Design a protein around this ligand. Structure first.
Ligand SMILES: Nc1ncnc2c1ccn2[C@@H]1O[C@H](CO)[C@@H](O)[C@H]1O
Ligand SMILES: Nc1ncnc2c1ccn2[C@@H]1O[C@H](CO)[C@@H](O)[C@H]1O
Ligand SMILES: Nc1ncnc2c1ccn2[C@@H]1O[C@H](CO)[C@@H](O)[C@H]1O
Lengths: 286, 279, 284
């Protein structure tokens, strides 16, 4: 049986994706999650929603308790996490109103709790060195992309399509994010450096969320919402564009939950769990 | 109504820029500043001076309470902050004894309190996401540059002058800093990587000071003092640098007092309010 | 008189005894093994403790280095498992590093400061060439003496690279861990020109210089990180399997290096190490 957790970012502080059946006010061994967890169903598929920043968007990116959010969803029996992440574009073909189903990242965060494990008494016992070459659940990424196709949203894959298929607004079928600490936005100098490294978007919340999801044995995928060009490059139209983006992502998320529930995930879930065990350095040395 | 704060770095642990009127021992919601704050007048312009590292320079760059220093200057009524920052050059044209009126940076610091706002009880309530594309106050940058001209110090502007006009010692009219955490200096490998990224100087103290000044609604500009080439490639030179940076600061204070800042001060304050995402 | 400490990586003589020490900065990773190589006193310290329970970001580098300083060590030889970012550095090779790029954070990386849990002072140490060059060349000559190939990219051709070899120079990026790198990070580090990626070199190398000690690292290439094919992407089992095979050569190099160190006069080098610390004391 699957159960899909949803971590909603900017624009999803108070989602209302389904009829609320129950609420869970919980804590974890790592502290309090960002807010109450909301339980319900998309069709016959159990779903749990949590706003990354809390209902009033009072928690900044560096202070989000990523460990508690991921562990709370694990404790409720989630098998998957779908996340939204607002971002700035570093590249001309990613324009405000587009989305990116990320497959890669470069980490420039610091000072955040980014692992459940360690040698101190307040972390889980053991040492975990997780492979992160392709850090998302690929099967779940392809679900997000197919959900966009099913909801009549353009999909652009630069590996197989010419630039003529980059029709806006579109879901970019791959992409890399730099995660910065915030809360300040980047300088023009930083933006040009990240662009020169070949990164596609900049955001403040993907890491360590994606890392902790893999440590928890959960299938994780992010859909990033391009809200503007970062500073390497009217306001009423911007806010309206973001509103329309949120409507489209809500459509993608609900279709994605249905598509996840339509398939069997037994082997993928067992492989998620086995990857955690095989990454326990303290167990493999003995 | 303007009042100019001055944060003195290396070579400015005990500046004595003017006859002291008062000495302020203050606290802030973020702790105590690096030292007492000295207040007085330069001409008719009110001025406040604070040594970044304290009188004895006993506080290393990663342990400076940037939040307390900036907040204390704001509390005493400062509208502007002028800061000095010692640095190493990453570029052939920036030689020891030159100064740089910075306009950009790349941040490699960690573990420092870099914002006044958050969700924890030790910060002001709110989520503040400040634009930083051009992170300095441009009017105040141009004041530093005009102050150097008024004191007959060479200015080199790469966008409008040939390289043959780069006559040393000179004030470079623009430049980018990488801020590293310290206390160690860079390796040759790190210096070459920073150079290849296009950065001009390396220093340990610019960030988060520049960021917190904008959060506090203040106009901030830095003058960096090139002390040596960084290791991709002195005391007597630095003493002469301090003498001329002092002249620049004192002239810059006079020049700030010579204009109206009403709309810039208003814009500084409104930018903070418009950057509050929780509101 | 010289005395060589050895800080041992993942899978880590005439043993006299085992010693527990305390330090102003806490307890070292584990007890220390005291002995001799010939007539040269030697002390061995595992970086991660006996059960390998301490991850790289939580190793007490300050206590490990200071413990060896307090026992009278003049030299530290260190091993560090790593991933290769470059075609000619292959699993089973070794690198006598001469450079690094630091991406660690949150680790205690200096003995000095203004907080009560550090020594009083402000120490700004030069780090242009952050290793002891004399000791680096001892590690390379030790490999020659044990019939292990040495590859110098300054003087030799890729066609003349014979494996397993000790690479006579190289640069490391140190990441904080515990996770391995993404493919995107791996390619960015490769494009910066870095040779290997590891998690334990920094701040160990920096603190050794703060302590006035001669320090050199021999990195053990266990994998190609993750910039190559999917079957070559790093994981714990891959690191451990190659490490177990390479430690035999690393032991031979280290034991020979200790003998070579004890056969030379180090009076002025040691004086220079200490004088570098004193001249970096800005508060004085
Ligand atoms: N250009 C950018 N650089 C960094 N972060 C950005 C953007 C655009 C959006 N975000 C995300 O939105 C929030 C800040 O408004 C943050 O929560 C952040 O994740
Ligand atoms: N080459 C360099 N790299 C980094 N920092 C440098 C230099 C040269 C000067 N500084 C600044 O001066 C102090 C170090 O003595 C520190 O306070 C620092 O800001
Ligand atoms: N490809 C890689 N990236 C980062 N670190 C790596 C490797 C390969 C090995 N190591 C080092 O070995 C330990 C991880 O098990 C860690 O202690 C680490 O120092």
């Amino acid at each position: 049986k699957v159960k899909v957790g949803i971590i909603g970012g900017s624009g999803f502080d108070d989602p209302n994706l389904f009829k609320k059946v129950g609420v869970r006010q919980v804590t974890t061994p790592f502290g309090k999650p960002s807010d109450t967890l909301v339980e319900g169903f998309v069709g016959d598929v159990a779903c749990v929603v949590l706003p990354r920043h809390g209902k009033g968007h009072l928690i900044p990116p560096s202070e989000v308790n990523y460990r508690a959010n991921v562990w709370a969803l694990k404790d409720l029996g989630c098998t998957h996490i779908l996340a939204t992440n607002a971002c700035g574009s570093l590249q001309e073909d990613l324009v405000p109103g587009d989305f990116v189903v990320l497959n890669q990242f470069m980490d420039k965060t610091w000072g955040r709790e980014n692992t459940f494990y360690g040698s101190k008494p307040d972390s889980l016992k053991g040492v975990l060195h997780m492979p992160m070459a392709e850090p998302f659940c690929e099967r779940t990424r392809q679900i997000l992309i197919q959900a966009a196709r099913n909801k009549s949203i353009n999909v652009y894959d630069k590996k197989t399509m010419d630039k003529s298929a980059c029709i806006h607004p579109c879901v970019h079928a791959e992409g890399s994010a730099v995660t910065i600490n915030g809360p300040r936005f980047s300088t023009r100098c930083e933006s040009f450096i990240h662009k020169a490294m070949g990164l596609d978007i900049v955001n403040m919340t993907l890491v360590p969320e994606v890392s902790l999801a893999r440590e928890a044995g959960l299938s994780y995928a992010s859909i990033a919402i391009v809200t503007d060009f970062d500073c390497w490059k009217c306001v009423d139209m911007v806010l309206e564009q973001f509103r329309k983006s949120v409507v489209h992502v809500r459509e993608i998320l609900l279709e994605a939950v249905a598509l996840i529930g339509a398939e069997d995930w037994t082997k993928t879930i067992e492989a998620n769990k086995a990857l955690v065990m095989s990454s326990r350095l303290d167990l493999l040395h003995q």
